[PDB]
Amino acid sequence: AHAPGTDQMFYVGTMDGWYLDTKLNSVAIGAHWSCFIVLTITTFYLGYESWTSRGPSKRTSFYAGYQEEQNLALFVNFFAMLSYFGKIVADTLGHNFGDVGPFIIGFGNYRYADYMLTCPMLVYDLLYQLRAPYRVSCSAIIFAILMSGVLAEFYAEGDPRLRNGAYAWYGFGCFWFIFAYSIVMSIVAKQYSRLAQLAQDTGAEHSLHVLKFAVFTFSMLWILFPLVWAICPRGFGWIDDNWTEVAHCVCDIVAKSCYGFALARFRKTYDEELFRLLEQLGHD
Amino acid sequence: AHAPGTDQMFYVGTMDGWYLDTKLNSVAIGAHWSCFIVLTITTFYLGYESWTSRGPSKRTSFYAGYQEEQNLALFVNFFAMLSYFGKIVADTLGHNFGDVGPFIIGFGNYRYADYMLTCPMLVYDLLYQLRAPYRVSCSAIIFAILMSGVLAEFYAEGDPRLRNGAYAWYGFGCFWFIFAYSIVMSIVAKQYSRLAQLAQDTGAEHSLHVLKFAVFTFSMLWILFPLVWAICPRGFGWIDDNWTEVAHCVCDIVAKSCYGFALARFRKTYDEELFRLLEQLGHD
Amino acid sequence: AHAPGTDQMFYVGTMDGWYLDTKLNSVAIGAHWSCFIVLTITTFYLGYESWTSRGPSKRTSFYAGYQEEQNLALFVNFFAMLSYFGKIVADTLGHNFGDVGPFIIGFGNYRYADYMLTCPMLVYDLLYQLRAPYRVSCSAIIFAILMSGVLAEFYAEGDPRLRNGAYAWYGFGCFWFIFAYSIVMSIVAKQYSRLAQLAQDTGAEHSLHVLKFAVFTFSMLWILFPLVWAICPRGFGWIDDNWTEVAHCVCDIVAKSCYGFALARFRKTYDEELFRLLEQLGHD
Ligand SMILES: CCCCCCCC/C=C/CCCCCCCC(=O)OC[C@H](COP(=O)(O)OCCN)OC(=O)CCCCCCC/C=C/CCCCCCCC
Ligand SMILES: CCCCCCCC/C=C/CCCCCCCC(=O)OC[C@H](COP(=O)(O)OCCN)OC(=O)CCCCCCC/C=C/CCCCCCCC
Ligand SMILES: CCCCCCCC/C=C/CCCCCCCC(=O)OC[C@H](COP(=O)(O)OCCN)OC(=O)CCCCCCC/C=C/CCCCCCCC
Ligand SMILES: *C/C=C(C)/C=C/C=C(C)/C=C/C1=C(C)CCCC1(C)C
Ligand SMILES: *C/C=C(C)/C=C/C=C(C)/C=C/C1=C(C)CCCC1(C)C
Ligand SMILES: *C/C=C(C)/C=C/C=C(C)/C=C/C1=C(C)CCCC1(C)C
């Protein structure tokens, strides 16, 4: 696209940039391949667990089939895998893939477009494991945050005269994210405290460690994406391009693969009375 | 974009128009600022009410947290605020924002793209207050109507040879809107009549006035948007550009801020028996 | 859009192609008109049935109003009609409509963009009639399949150097589709077998034929779209353009109009005990 006052051509958000040669080196391609392989493996494992998923009483034939919330995390991984497959194709075809082409929600040819479909699922699943209140609201807040990030990317990659708008959108996102983060942490802490005071002088003591570790670590590890934005060329620029791709791949692996594996481990050790305690949690 | 048979350049739906200088005067900018401020204030107030929301029995700790339908209206305002924030940034950066750039659902850089995410929420919330039937169906109809409006905008702002298609889409939308409007009015009337015959010789007589006023006024006041389309330059052209922005800001304020404030007022006076009557309404 | 190394201009995904003259002959226009008329008729009939829809006990006033799953199929037809109306306008205005213009989910100006909104509804409705498990999961799989098809279309209609990516995406879609197809067939078979062993020595024997025919035929007839893709110019090229439009119109008619009519016929003959059997089906 052309801009007034200059002859420079800007390829962001246009089909012209879709046909440009790729700007990535071998490191980014290797990171994309590794993330795709890991996501495929985790998707297959979660699908296998969902198929052979007896209930907490180990009596229901298809427990995840009738109560599909247990499949929610699986969905994330599956869609995440899709969001990487296209990337892989790009590195095989040698054409540009960064912030060019059509805007499709759930497809990661834009920086935060793929997260806009899976992040609410992640927040809902994390809050649902403790039967916490304010599940859909946090998902809506996260959806708005990712929309703000997408607009920040559009403003950052465009005409220089409209560069400060990127910072403005980033600030908006950060403000609301801080609010949501604090709320989520408080809610999680309260819920876990109640669970700890419900399981006193009672078994299932080992599974509580796994649940606590998973929920707390994978709720606190969401600060990585704003820090990456701060250090990427859109911010300070401490790490150049082709290294923010590796950082995003590592963040996606930690946020999705490890979280799904932790939930799979937790669902393999809990039993009826802990399920009843979890049900009692969401009653007050 | 270029068009056959002419050298004229059309900037609708392109990234070229995203970098163009703004066409708005100070009045439209002031209207955008006022609407953003009002939406921010209402979002904060609704969030505060949702946090300190005891149930109708005034016993539940987090009533809106576990039954999140009460938060629905809040969501609208929040997203509406987002849809204006970007607009604000545009007026600060001095670049064009009308029907240019990427197409993101829920972002108001296109005329009716932002309404496509919040209008079904508004219809569902309005029909849910009376426990009325046909809630999701009306939301789907409204979603289709806003899609028709978006396509009408695309046809209107494009090549002149394809201008009549705008009118065609407008007609489609109007037809279905008339159908939905009649259906909604009938349903609301019937439900309120039943409520009036359920609360006879019973208290809670003051809150019925507030509920009736809110539901009836904010269901009838949806005719304003087709009239604005009729009088805007896309239709007759009685009011020029930079004044349809003020009209849309006023319509958004009335449809969202006042509706949320009215529901907040209603939820502050009703009690257990009116809640039981509302539950009895959705049983037949 | 321009591509490096050549002066050829590619109109896919651009606003430039929106203003180009139409490439369709009279046969494609007639097929579009026939499909639009059929979808309009079925939408009106399904709306009439939904309005005058007594329950299985023939006692509830608005059965579909309070339990809106019965309206789900109707929604499909309605949206399908919208997806054709715009097409009709294009043939009246004489401008290009194939894979050009804005990308709107649910609007069929791209090949598989309209199916991405109605196909999950179709899968959920088909699996819900037997109270089968894994309803939302199959809908998500189908949504991913249609996204893969859309990306395949983008790669196929673009620069020749990036043509093999179309095949790659097609393969991805086919793989996952095969998985989903097998799963769906197995589930349906098991559910129907249980229903057959629940209605033994019991009436409602005529409605079982209609249910079996509808579910089995309209689950098996989903293989037509991959075969059309295989034989269309994007694949082997056995049938040229302007004949894949007729094939897609016929496939849409069979998949939506006939399915809705079959469900309407089935809902006109079943009664209380078959409803209780259907409820018993989803319990194990
Ligand atoms: C603006 C965007 C905000 C996004 C906020 C939402 C974030 C995502 C929320 C995910 C919600 C859960 C998705 C899966 C639904 C599964 C629910 C379910 O199976 O149970 C519900 C219910 C109760 O069954 P039980 O009694 O447990 O059965 C036991 C008897 N054998 O049964 C049903 O399945 C009824 C259907 C309810 C769900 C209907 C489908 C809703 C789908 C919504 C979209 C989900 C994806 C959201 C993606 C967002 C991308 C922007
Ligand atoms: C083609 C688009 C058509 C759009 C049609 C839909 C319009 C919007 C409809 C909004 C539906 C309501 C959204 C909020 C869901 C909250 C429901 C809820 O909290 O209760 C449901 C249920 C029952 O709980 P109770 O028994 O009341 O709890 C008491 C025990 N302590 O609990 C649950 O939350 C289960 C989850 C159900 C909801 C799952 C999430 C669904 C989200 C769908 C998308 C919503 C946004 C739609 C935006 C549309 C934009 C195009
Ligand atoms: C990533 C995309 C994956 C898509 C997966 C989802 C595929 C579509 C699933 C469709 C789910 C059903 C849609 C219609 C919801 C209607 C449910 C309903 O009416 O009952 C639910 C419930 C129970 O009522 P009963 O007790 O039966 O009432 C009897 C008392 N008189 O009541 C409610 O309506 C509560 C609200 C629940 C539904 C909330 C709305 C959810 C809308 C989700 C989006 C649907 C469209 C999806 C389009 C997908 C396009 C990508
Ligand atoms: C699997 C992916 C996950 C969990 C992604 C999470 C992403 C965020 C929490 C992103 C946050 C952002 C901001 C707070 C500010 C603006 C930009 C973002 C998108 C990096
Ligand atoms: C907060 C915003 C609200 C409630 C918006 C409501 C908008 C409408 C009812 C719009 C209707 C339209 C038509 C009936 C015809 C075609 C164009 C529209 C979009 C103006
Ligand atoms: C009403 C429309 C319906 C039921 C459409 C169904 C479409 C499919 C099952 C399409 C499948 C595809 C693949 C399996 C591979 C890639 C391309 C598609 C989109 C043709």
mmCIF file of C-alpha atoms in Angstrom, chain B residues 125-270:
data_model
loop_
_atom_site.group_PDB
_atom_site.id
_atom_site.type_symbol
_atom_site.label_atom_id
_atom_site.label_comp_id
_atom_site.label_asym_id
_atom_site.label_seq_id
_atom_site.Cartn_x
_atom_site.Cartn_y
_atom_site.Cartn_z
ATOM 1 C CA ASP B 125 -30.136 -9.722 27.607
ATOM 2 C CA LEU B 126 -33.325 -7.805 26.797
ATOM 3 C CA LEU B 127 -35.284 -11.000 26.115
ATOM 4 C CA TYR B 128 -33.777 -12.761 29.151
ATOM 5 C CA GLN B 129 -35.014 -10.158 31.651
ATOM 6 C CA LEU B 130 -38.588 -11.347 31.035
ATOM 7 C CA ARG B 131 -37.565 -15.014 30.520
ATOM 8 C CA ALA B 132 -39.012 -14.717 27.013
ATOM 9 C CA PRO B 133 -38.810 -17.493 24.400
ATOM 10 C CA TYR B 134 -36.845 -17.210 21.148
ATOM 11 C CA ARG B 135 -33.685 -15.643 22.571
ATOM 12 C CA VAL B 136 -30.900 -17.136 20.435
ATOM 13 C CA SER B 137 -33.045 -16.974 17.283
ATOM 14 C CA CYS B 138 -33.514 -13.205 17.568
ATOM 15 C CA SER B 139 -29.776 -12.817 18.182
ATOM 16 C CA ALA B 140 -29.034 -14.771 14.996
ATOM 17 C CA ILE B 141 -31.502 -12.616 13.050
ATOM 18 C CA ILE B 142 -29.827 -9.449 14.347
ATOM 19 C CA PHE B 143 -26.401 -10.857 13.443
ATOM 20 C CA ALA B 144 -27.617 -11.475 9.886
ATOM 21 C CA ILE B 145 -29.074 -7.949 9.767
ATOM 22 C CA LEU B 146 -25.744 -6.403 10.752
ATOM 23 C CA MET B 147 -23.932 -8.544 8.177
ATOM 24 C CA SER B 148 -26.357 -7.209 5.561
ATOM 25 C CA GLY B 149 -25.601 -3.671 6.728
ATOM 26 C CA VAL B 150 -21.856 -4.276 6.419
ATOM 27 C CA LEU B 151 -22.250 -5.560 2.856
ATOM 28 C CA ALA B 152 -24.454 -2.556 2.066
ATOM 29 C CA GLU B 153 -21.678 -0.264 3.314
ATOM 30 C CA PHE B 154 -19.125 -2.076 1.138
ATOM 31 C CA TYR B 155 -21.336 -1.716 -1.937
ATOM 32 C CA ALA B 156 -22.124 1.933 -1.168
ATOM 33 C CA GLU B 157 -18.506 3.058 -0.715
ATOM 34 C CA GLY B 158 -17.188 1.224 -3.786
ATOM 35 C CA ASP B 159 -17.332 1.654 -7.547
ATOM 36 C CA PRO B 160 -20.400 3.643 -8.704
ATOM 37 C CA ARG B 161 -21.385 0.936 -11.208
ATOM 38 C CA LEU B 162 -22.023 -1.384 -8.228
ATOM 39 C CA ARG B 163 -23.954 1.163 -6.153
ATOM 40 C CA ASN B 164 -27.468 -0.324 -6.445
ATOM 41 C CA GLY B 165 -26.315 -3.440 -4.612
ATOM 42 C CA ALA B 166 -26.080 -1.303 -1.484
ATOM 43 C CA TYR B 167 -29.797 -0.557 -1.752
ATOM 44 C CA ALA B 168 -30.494 -4.241 -2.391
ATOM 45 C CA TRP B 169 -28.692 -5.299 0.775
ATOM 46 C CA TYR B 170 -30.393 -2.523 2.728
ATOM 47 C CA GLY B 171 -33.775 -3.781 1.579
ATOM 48 C CA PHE B 172 -32.896 -7.331 2.594
ATOM 49 C CA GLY B 173 -31.863 -6.154 6.036
ATOM 50 C CA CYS B 174 -34.950 -4.002 6.479
ATOM 51 C CA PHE B 175 -37.287 -6.834 5.522
ATOM 52 C CA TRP B 176 -35.809 -9.246 8.025
ATOM 53 C CA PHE B 177 -35.516 -6.528 10.657
ATOM 54 C CA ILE B 178 -39.208 -5.711 10.333
ATOM 55 C CA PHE B 179 -40.026 -9.380 10.828
ATOM 56 C CA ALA B 180 -37.808 -9.665 13.894
ATOM 57 C CA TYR B 181 -39.067 -6.387 15.330
ATOM 58 C CA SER B 182 -42.696 -7.453 15.135
ATOM 59 C CA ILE B 183 -41.922 -10.846 16.652
ATOM 60 C CA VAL B 184 -39.928 -9.328 19.504
ATOM 61 C CA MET B 185 -42.603 -6.768 20.309
ATOM 62 C CA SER B 186 -45.332 -9.401 20.387
ATOM 63 C CA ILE B 187 -43.307 -11.694 22.634
ATOM 64 C CA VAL B 188 -42.396 -8.895 25.032
ATOM 65 C CA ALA B 189 -45.992 -7.718 25.265
ATOM 66 C CA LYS B 190 -47.282 -11.205 26.017
ATOM 67 C CA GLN B 191 -44.636 -11.826 28.664
ATOM 68 C CA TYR B 192 -45.287 -8.527 30.403
ATOM 69 C CA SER B 193 -49.030 -9.150 30.344
ATOM 70 C CA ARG B 194 -48.493 -12.472 32.088
ATOM 71 C CA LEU B 195 -46.233 -10.796 34.642
ATOM 72 C CA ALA B 196 -48.906 -8.165 35.270
ATOM 73 C CA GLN B 197 -51.471 -10.891 35.873
ATOM 74 C CA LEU B 198 -49.031 -12.718 38.174
ATOM 75 C CA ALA B 199 -48.247 -9.762 40.465
ATOM 76 C CA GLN B 200 -51.877 -8.747 41.056
ATOM 77 C CA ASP B 201 -52.690 -8.171 44.743
ATOM 78 C CA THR B 202 -48.959 -8.447 45.450
ATOM 79 C CA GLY B 203 -46.089 -6.101 46.262
ATOM 80 C CA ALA B 204 -43.005 -5.229 44.183
ATOM 81 C CA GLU B 205 -45.247 -2.778 42.333
ATOM 82 C CA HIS B 206 -42.561 -0.083 41.982
ATOM 83 C CA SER B 207 -39.964 -2.287 40.260
ATOM 84 C CA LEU B 208 -42.518 -3.295 37.622
ATOM 85 C CA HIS B 209 -42.597 0.308 36.376
ATOM 86 C CA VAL B 210 -38.814 0.331 35.938
ATOM 87 C CA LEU B 211 -38.806 -3.047 34.191
ATOM 88 C CA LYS B 212 -41.645 -2.046 31.847
ATOM 89 C CA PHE B 213 -40.066 1.307 30.979
ATOM 90 C CA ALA B 214 -36.638 -0.202 30.334
ATOM 91 C CA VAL B 215 -37.766 -3.156 28.222
ATOM 92 C CA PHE B 216 -40.329 -1.252 26.152
ATOM 93 C CA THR B 217 -38.295 1.899 25.502
ATOM 94 C CA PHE B 218 -35.048 0.088 24.716
ATOM 95 C CA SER B 219 -36.868 -2.365 22.465
ATOM 96 C CA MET B 220 -38.699 0.356 20.514
ATOM 97 C CA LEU B 221 -35.635 2.614 20.201
ATOM 98 C CA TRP B 222 -33.953 0.207 17.756
ATOM 99 C CA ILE B 223 -35.658 1.883 14.764
ATOM 100 C CA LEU B 224 -33.175 4.771 14.968
ATOM 101 C CA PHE B 225 -30.376 2.998 13.065
ATOM 102 C CA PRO B 226 -32.439 2.297 9.890
ATOM 103 C CA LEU B 227 -33.689 5.900 9.978
ATOM 104 C CA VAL B 228 -30.112 7.182 10.257
ATOM 105 C CA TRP B 229 -29.173 4.980 7.298
ATOM 106 C CA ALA B 230 -32.143 6.412 5.389
ATOM 107 C CA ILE B 231 -31.141 10.030 6.084
ATOM 108 C CA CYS B 232 -27.350 9.587 5.814
ATOM 109 C CA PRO B 233 -25.518 10.127 2.493
ATOM 110 C CA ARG B 234 -25.923 6.410 1.733
ATOM 111 C CA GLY B 235 -29.651 7.138 1.485
ATOM 112 C CA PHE B 236 -31.427 10.439 0.900
ATOM 113 C CA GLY B 237 -28.466 12.510 2.063
ATOM 114 C CA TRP B 238 -30.436 14.968 4.194
ATOM 115 C CA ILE B 239 -27.563 15.204 6.702
ATOM 116 C CA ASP B 240 -24.041 15.271 5.297
ATOM 117 C CA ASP B 241 -21.042 13.389 6.617
ATOM 118 C CA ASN B 242 -19.489 14.338 9.992
ATOM 119 C CA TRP B 243 -23.076 14.572 11.325
ATOM 120 C CA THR B 244 -23.952 10.890 10.964
ATOM 121 C CA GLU B 245 -21.044 10.217 13.329
ATOM 122 C CA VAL B 246 -22.739 12.375 15.975
ATOM 123 C CA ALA B 247 -26.052 10.606 15.347
ATOM 124 C CA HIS B 248 -24.409 7.186 15.672
ATOM 125 C CA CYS B 249 -22.668 8.270 18.885
ATOM 126 C CA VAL B 250 -25.985 9.446 20.348
ATOM 127 C CA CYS B 251 -27.699 6.217 19.274
ATOM 128 C CA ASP B 252 -24.937 4.113 20.849
ATOM 129 C CA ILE B 253 -25.132 6.110 24.086
ATOM 130 C CA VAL B 254 -28.914 5.708 24.295
ATOM 131 C CA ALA B 255 -28.864 2.026 23.332
ATOM 132 C CA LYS B 256 -26.036 0.932 25.655
ATOM 133 C CA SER B 257 -25.329 3.426 28.463
ATOM 134 C CA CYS B 258 -28.967 4.157 29.301
ATOM 135 C CA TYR B 259 -29.971 0.496 28.973
ATOM 136 C CA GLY B 260 -27.216 -0.638 31.335
ATOM 137 C CA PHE B 261 -28.064 2.112 33.814
ATOM 138 C CA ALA B 262 -31.755 1.157 33.705
ATOM 139 C CA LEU B 263 -30.972 -2.510 34.364
ATOM 140 C CA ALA B 264 -28.657 -1.476 37.208
ATOM 141 C CA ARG B 265 -31.500 0.564 38.707
ATOM 142 C CA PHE B 266 -33.949 -2.332 38.322
ATOM 143 C CA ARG B 267 -31.609 -4.839 39.983
ATOM 144 C CA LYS B 268 -31.360 -2.547 43.038
ATOM 145 C CA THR B 269 -35.047 -2.744 44.011
ATOM 146 C CA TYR B 270 -36.364 -6.203 43.138
#
